[PDB]
Each structure stands twice: as structure tokens, then as C-alpha cells.
Amino acid sequence: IVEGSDAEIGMSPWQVMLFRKSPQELLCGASLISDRWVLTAAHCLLYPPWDKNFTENDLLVRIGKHSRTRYERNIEKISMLEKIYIHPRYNWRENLDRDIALMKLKKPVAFSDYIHPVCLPDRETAASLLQAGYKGRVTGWGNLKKGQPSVLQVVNLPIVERPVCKDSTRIRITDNMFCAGYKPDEGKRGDACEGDSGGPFVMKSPFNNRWYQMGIVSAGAGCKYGFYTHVFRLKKWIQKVIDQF
Amino acid sequence: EADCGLRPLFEKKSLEDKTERELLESYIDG
């Protein structure tokens, strides 16, 4: 995260870390949406342009973490990926359209004051909170500009108008995505950097005080606007996979 | 899942995280 700050312990109990086994290091971010389901970007696991193809065994998930590296007894829990589900229509060759993936755990994880699932949107919530101007929140252990944050970072940023999203790049932004971030003339900066991909983009609903995941970090603006996966746009798919298992 | 979105150390104790208000203000405008 760029221009963010150290998050408060348990400020995002749904944050999930995708830790690689060798080299042992952080791969991406993710969120906990249930006791057995983890949500992340598709390119965090499979991205041919970079010869990237991670199998379930190539890693695991560290849940309820705060520090970026230090192991955290009686705080973080580690799970084993049972199955990975990349979106069928996920295309990387053009613009990461439908850059989303589901990861099921071999064993359900218990919740705590540090580990707690986030709610997925719905047309009402989405249609009402997904509006340019409104600020969402992003978190992660991605780089900063040393460039390695000690603990999870946090930053809030505005949704940018689809029209503006378009002009800001030659990439054909689809409806399954939306861009967020500040305009150069805003002064204040802040965005998702490399390593924060697969991370949750959330909003606190005023109509019920609960936090909702509107997007997934697909293409951080820098370290221009960041591109995120439209979670509701793909909710249908999510369930289809859930009901399936 | 039925208690999702509410933070054990924040909402559940009537506490506001360091900068969530900013988000609230966004809905308003400033």
C-alpha cells in the first residue's frame, strides 16, 4: 500500500495472506468470506505472461495475521488449500477481466477477535455504495514505494467514474471491474501496490454498520488509478461455486 | 457469515478504527 499507514490490530479480521512455500514469501492478499472460503484475484495464482501457475500445494494461507513476516502464535491460523477455482471467463491476455478466484480450505477455521469473515455485497448495497466519490478501503502487506512494511497497511480511496477510468488508460475496462484512487490534482495520494493484489476492497455500510467487500485488488495504480474486481458483478459465480461445495 | 462485516475488536465494543470516519465523510462529501 502506498501512502497508507500501519493498520490497527484486528482492524481487518478478514484479511488473508497468500504465503508461497519456496521462495518462502508473500504472494498476495485475500479475504475470508466464510469458515472455509477465501477470495482472491485470479492472476495471483495463474498468470501465463509471467509464467505463473501455482497449484494448491505450492502454498497455503495465513489467516488473522498482522505482521508481514513474523509468525504469530495464538493469533494467526494457517490453513491448507483444498481446491482452487479460477473464473472460467477470466482473461489475462487483455486486461485481467474477471480476475477472481476461490480457495477452499481443507478444514474450517474458527473465528476470533483477529479472524472474522466479511460480508459480500448485494444489488442494494452495491448499487448504493458503488458510486464515484465514495471512499472504499484497501489493506495489505504489499510494498510501499526500505520498501517493505512491517505490519499490514491500510488506506482509503475514492471510486473514480467509469468514464474517467477509461480515458486513464488504453485498457478496455470491462463492467466486471471498477477503478478507484485519487486524481493527480487531489494532492493526497494512496493506492494498492504490488503484493496487495488479491486483497479486499471494502466499504462500511451506513444502513447496517457492517463492512462489505466491493472489490478485489486486480491492478494497483502505483508504487493513474487502481483496477479492482467488481465483486457483486460476479456474486452469481461465487455462489454457483459455493453451492457446488 | 451471519455475523460477517462486524469487527470483534471494533464494532462489537463500540470503537471506531483510526480512519473509518473518512469513509463516512465520503458518503457526505467532506
Experimental technique, in short, is X-ray
Does the bond joining A23 to the residue before it have cis omega, within 30 degrees of 0?
yes
Q: What's the reported resolution, in angstroms, to a tenth?
A: 2.8
Q: Quickly list H helices, A122-229.
A: 123-129, 162-167
A13-117+233-245, CATH topology level? Thrombin, subunit H (2.40.10)
Q: Do B27 and A206 touch (CB under 8 A)?
A: yes
How far is it, in rounded angstroms, from Cα A48 to Cα A126? 32
Residue A222 in contact with partner chain B when CB distance is under 8 A? no
CATH superfamily of A1-12+118-232: Trypsin-like serine proteases (2.40.10.10)
Question: What is the b/e burial string over B13-26, where b = at least 16 CB atoms within 10 angstroms of the residue's CB?
Answer: eeeebebbeebeeb
Of residues A13, A133, A136, nearest to B8 (C-beta): A13
A148 C-beta neighbours (distance < 10 Å), count: 12
Strand ranges (DSSP E) for A67-152? 77-79, 81-86, 101-105, 135-140
Handedness of CA A108, A102, A230, A224 (dihedral sign): positive
Cell matching residue A31: 479475504
Alpha-carbon separation of residue A168 from A23, A87, A126, A182 (angstroms): 35, 26, 23, 12
The CA distance from A33 to the nearest CA of chain B, in Å, is 7
Nearest partner of A226 among A184, A192, A195, A175, judged by Cα: A192
Distance of CA A208 to the CA centre of its chain: 22
Cell matching residue A2: 502506498
Q: Report the residue numbers after which chain A has a gap, meaning the C atom sits over 2.5 angstroms from the next written residue's N, or none.
A: 145, 223
Query: What residues of A are annotated to the active site?
Result: 43, 99, 197
Domain ranges of chain A: 1-12+118-232, 13-117+233-245
Q: In what order do the strands lie in the sheet with A81-86?
A: A77-79, A59-63, A15-21, A24-32, A37-40, A101-105, A81-86
Distance of CA B3 to the CA centre of its chain: 14
B1-30, CATH topology level? Epsilon-Thrombin; Chain L (4.10.140)
A23 burial (CB, 10 Å; 0-12 / 13-18 / 19+) is exposed
Radius of gyration of chain A (CA): 16
Nearest partner of A196 among A132, A237, A238, A137, judged by Cα: A137
Contacts of B11 in chain A (CB under 8 A): 209-210
Residue A160 in contact with partner chain B when CB distance is under 8 A? no
Q: Do B5 and A8 touch (CB under 8 A)?
A: no
Cα nearest neighbour of B28 on chain A: A134
Domain ranges of chain B: 1-30
Q: Do A136 and B23 touch (CB under 8 A)?
A: yes
